[PDB]
Design an enzyme around this catalytic site. Structure first.
Site, PDB file in Angstrom:
ATOM      1  N   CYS A 268       0.822  -1.206   0.000  1.00 32.91           N
ATOM      2  CA  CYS A 268       0.000   0.000   0.000  1.00 32.91           C
ATOM      3  C   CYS A 268       0.867   1.272   0.000  1.00 32.91           C
ATOM      4  CB  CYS A 268      -0.922  -0.035   1.231  1.00 32.91           C
ATOM      5  SG  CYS A 268      -1.941   1.426   1.537  1.00 32.91           S
TER       6      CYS A 268
ATOM      7  N   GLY B  85       5.412   0.856  30.588  1.00 33.20           N
ATOM      8  CA  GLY B  85       5.146   0.618  29.183  1.00 33.20           C
ATOM      9  C   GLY B  85       3.969  -0.312  28.996  1.00 33.20           C
TER      10      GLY B  85
HETATM   11  N1  LIG Z   1       7.472  -3.049  27.394  1.00 38.83           N
HETATM   12  C1  LIG Z   1       7.486  -2.615  28.658  1.00 38.83           C
HETATM   13  N2  LIG Z   1       8.536  -1.915  29.117  1.00 38.83           N
HETATM   14  C2  LIG Z   1       8.551  -1.450  30.368  1.00 38.83           C
HETATM   15  N3  LIG Z   1       7.534  -1.668  31.199  1.00 38.83           N
HETATM   16  C3  LIG Z   1       6.463  -2.370  30.800  1.00 38.83           C
HETATM   17  C4  LIG Z   1       6.412  -2.858  29.507  1.00 38.83           C
HETATM   18  N4  LIG Z   1       5.264  -3.509  29.367  1.00 38.83           N
HETATM   19  C5  LIG Z   1       4.604  -3.444  30.535  1.00 38.83           C
HETATM   20  N5  LIG Z   1       5.343  -2.748  31.417  1.00 38.83           N
HETATM   21  C6  LIG Z   1       4.998  -2.539  32.842  1.00 38.83           C
HETATM   22  O1  LIG Z   1       4.783  -3.841  33.472  1.00 38.83           O
HETATM   23  C7  LIG Z   1       3.561  -3.759  34.277  1.00 38.83           C
HETATM   24  C8  LIG Z   1       2.441  -4.543  33.584  1.00 38.83           C
HETATM   25  O2  LIG Z   1       2.025  -3.910  32.360  1.00 38.83           O
HETATM   26  P1  LIG Z   1       0.456  -3.918  31.968  1.00 38.83           P
HETATM   27  O3  LIG Z   1      -0.075  -5.287  32.128  1.00 38.83           O
HETATM   28  O4  LIG Z   1       0.284  -3.247  30.660  1.00 38.83           O
HETATM   29  C9  LIG Z   1      -0.241  -2.906  33.315  1.00 38.83           C
HETATM   30  P2  LIG Z   1      -1.897  -2.197  32.962  1.00 38.83           P
HETATM   31  O5  LIG Z   1      -1.822  -1.256  31.813  1.00 38.83           O
HETATM   32  O6  LIG Z   1      -2.405  -1.655  34.241  1.00 38.83           O
HETATM   33  O7  LIG Z   1      -2.807  -3.477  32.504  1.00 38.83           O
HETATM   34  P3  LIG Z   1      -3.454  -3.569  30.986  1.00 38.83           P
HETATM   35  O8  LIG Z   1      -2.213  -3.683  29.984  1.00 38.83           O
HETATM   36  O9  LIG Z   1      -4.228  -4.980  30.922  1.00 38.83           O
HETATM   37  O10 LIG Z   1      -4.333  -2.436  30.637  1.00 38.83           O
HETATM   38  C10 LIG Z   1       3.199  -2.263  34.336  1.00 38.83           C
HETATM   39  O11 LIG Z   1       3.921  -1.610  35.388  1.00 38.83           O
HETATM   40  C11 LIG Z   1       3.678  -1.777  32.985  1.00 38.83           C
HETATM   41  O12 LIG Z   1       3.977  -0.372  33.072  1.00 38.83           O
HETATM   42 CO   LIG Z   2      -0.566   1.254  32.197  1.00 36.13          CO
HETATM   43 CO   LIG Z   3      -0.969  -2.084  29.657  1.00 37.37          CO
END
Ligand SMILES: Nc1ncnc2c1ncn2[C@@H]1O[C@H](COP(=O)(O)CP(=O)(O)OP(=O)(O)O)[C@@H](O)[C@H]1O
Ligand SMILES: [Co+2]
Ligand SMILES: [Co+2]
Ligand SMILES: Nc1ncnc2c1ncn2[C@@H]1O[C@H](COP(=O)(O)CP(=O)(O)OP(=O)(O)O)[C@@H](O)[C@H]1O
Ligand SMILES: [Co+2]
Ligand SMILES: [Co+2]
Ligand SMILES: [Co+2]
Ligand SMILES: [Co+2]
Ligand SMILES: [Co+2]
Ligand SMILES: [Co+2]
Ligand SMILES: [Co+2]
Ligand SMILES: [Co+2]
Lengths: 339, 343
Positions: free
Chosen positions: B20, B138
């Site tokens: 695309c 993240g």
């Molecule tokens: N790629 C990454 N790098 C750094 N921190 C990360 C990350 N992915 C997730 N985290 C951290 O690891 C923990 C778990 O992430 P998530 O499960 O996304 C928390 P949430 O957003 O409250 O739940 P949700 O994703 O179901 O909405 C959180 O503190 C998130 O900030």
């Molecule tokens: Co979050």
């Molecule tokens: Co999340």
């Protein structure tokens, strides 16, 4: 045979919430040496990062999801409410945001994309959050979300780790959305059939945040991708306690129960179940444990309070226009007891 | 007859060659978002359209940006670090200093594995450490096409934020990193090149634009941006259009990798280069051989800063740059005719 746009069919069959695994996630990150400073109040591990500057406590979070309904405008609005949820879960107020858009210009078209953005903008307007920009990338599997920056007024922020034994577990929205979304994906359901769940997914957690703060909650988190059991465990694990949850006291959509009993659910529900089974004490049938583990989209806040606070809870909830359900209590044993 | 039992994992093989064509060119998304009722407030200094959003709170000037990219090399560690330098680039391009960040990871747990993912994260963390930027969290999502990047928040000390809009006729165009990475990345993807053939390009993609920011601020640049996806002509055009002027670019003064030139001449370049060239077709004035225009339109990854300074700053451009330890190339000058002249 067969006598609008269908976003769900562009998502890889039989999903969850597109996430990549529970606890083990924040555990990987733990093994690294992360640069941090004196302003870093809360780093990786909670619903949002907390950073202090010029006397102000800022909170930062990011979340992107694949389509959860076929209507592009509603997907945009729901994804926005979902991203904002983590700010509210910290006791914060959303201030500004950036949009992250993954879509393919020929697997869809500008028109659809513009509807997703419109839904997002209208929800941000409601949350009085300013969209400051974003990034758009070519992707066959469409996704939309936001990174959000907010402020915790008067420096008070609620983490997942201050819960005490003997406190009540309060939930502000029903669970079971993942099951319904799987239902829409398979074409068994249409949006009209789940208007109530759609409304709950669209609802900002700002009113629940107020309720939560008003009841001087000790710990708080929102119920999303890892299911009610997974998110309840985060409070447990972080506060070094346990939780006793009564299935009969958990709010869920009747339709979620009818579908799950017919083995219609997102594969994500099973993965969430399998992750908590290592700390789960329960003799309930599996359809119940799958329902409790089902990924939730834009779920409510889950928090802990003292019984004594039940005094004006329903009054407060009323004026605020937010529902609540007492689903259990915290216990000393570091396990998740589901009865 | 002697097969390696060890796994391979070519990050680049997991990247899709979209069929695309890009509809959104330099500044189009900004024009598109104007057809929306957007909630904004008095603290919103710069909204949709620049390298970063600019927001004021009690006198503090914050800037916010987000960027995620698909793999540009096969080494997971290098990819994470490059993606990180690429995301921080927009804070620098506003004259800001990055403060904290969040990571966005799209990866397939089965078409890769936790170990490679740990390497991407490790590269990102080391680059953030160098940038003195705190990773605060993240989100990780399962995706067939690996993607990685960050949303970043920064601060503009003394309230000076530099936009793409304040340039004027008669100014010099300064670039701080070579162009041509998109062509080299395409060569890696086609199995024509190996990482060892592009060490210099990799070093530049890994370098933070912090020293360039200092040079840019020291010379009181009137406008600034960084060179990324739309190519040199496209990003130079963003300044032109927002500042309502044109630009004259001298190909002979433009820095680029020799290997990038050799590859384009044999038609090894990303389709994005043709799309970028097409975006500026109605404003382009040039009679140069087309491999030159293709190279100048080639998408850049984690590129340098591109800024305008008044002619009298030349007197200190060189001493200031040596002091700061950063390269710079004077590639052109702004003009009154709202056109893109490439000589
Ligand atoms: N790629 C990454 N790098 C750094 N921190 C990360 C990350 N992915 C997730 N985290 C951290 O690891 C923990 C778990 O992430 P998530 O499960 O996304 C928390 P949430 O957003 O409250 O739940 P949700 O994703 O179901 O909405 C959180 O503190 C998130 O900030
Ligand atoms: Co979050
Ligand atoms: Co999340
Ligand atoms: N989905 C989205 N929602 C709101 N704004 C968006 C957006 N996608 C892009 N934008 C904004 O539209 C303008 C162009 O986007 P980009 O090209 O991503 C700027 P950049 O990051 O400097 O270039 P780069 O993506 O090549 O690194 C910027 O102001 C960007 O913030
Ligand atoms: Co959360
Ligand atoms: Co979340
Ligand atoms: Co971008
Ligand atoms: Co919290
Ligand atoms: Co930029
Ligand atoms: Co940007
Ligand atoms: Co950028
Ligand atoms: Co700028």
């Amino acid at each position: 045979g067969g006598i609008m746009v269908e976003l769900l069919k562009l998502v890889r069959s039989s999903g969850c919430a597109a996430k990549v695994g529970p606890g083990d996630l924040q555990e990987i990150l733990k093994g690294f040496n992360i640069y941090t400073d004196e302003s870093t109040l809360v780093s990786i591990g909670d619903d949002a990062g907390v950073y202090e500057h010029n006397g102000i406590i800022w909170v930062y979070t990011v979340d992107i999801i694949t389509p959860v309904v076929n209507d592009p405008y509603l997907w945009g609005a729901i994804s926005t409410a979902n991203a904002l949820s983590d700010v509210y879960a910290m006791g914060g107020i959303p201030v500004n945001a950036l949009a992250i858009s993954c879509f393919n210009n020929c697997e869809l078209d500008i028109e659809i994309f513009r509807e997703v953005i419109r839904g997002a903008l209208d929800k941000l307007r409601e949350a009085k959050t300013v969209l400051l920009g974003g990034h758009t990338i070519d992707d066959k599997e469409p996704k939309f979300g936001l990174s959000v920056a907010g402020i915790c007024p008067e420096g008070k922020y609620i983490t997942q780790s201050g819960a005490q034994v003997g406190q009540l577990l309060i939930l502000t929205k029903p669970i079971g959305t993942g099951i319904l979304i799987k239902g829409l994906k398979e074409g068994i359901l249409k949006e009209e059939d789940i208007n109530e769940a759609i409304e709950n997914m669209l609802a900002l957690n700002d009113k629940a945040r107020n309720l939560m703060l008003s009841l001087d909650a000790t710990a708080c988190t929102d119920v999303t991708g890892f299911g009610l059991l997974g998110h309840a465990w985060n409070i447990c694990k972080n506060s070094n306690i346990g939780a006793r949850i009564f299935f009969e006291k958990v709010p869920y959509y009747q339709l979620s129960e009818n579908l799950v009993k017919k083995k219609i659910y997102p594969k994500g529900a099973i993965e969430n179940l399998n992750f908590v089974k290592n700390y789960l004490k329960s003799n309930l049938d599996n359809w119940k444990l799958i329902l409790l583990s089902d990924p939730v989209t834009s779920g409510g806040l889950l928090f802990t309070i003292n019984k004594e606070k039940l005094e004006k809870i329903d009054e407060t909830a009323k004026e605020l226009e937010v529902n609540y359900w007492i689903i259990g209590e915290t216990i000393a044993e570091n396990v998740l007891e589901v009865l």
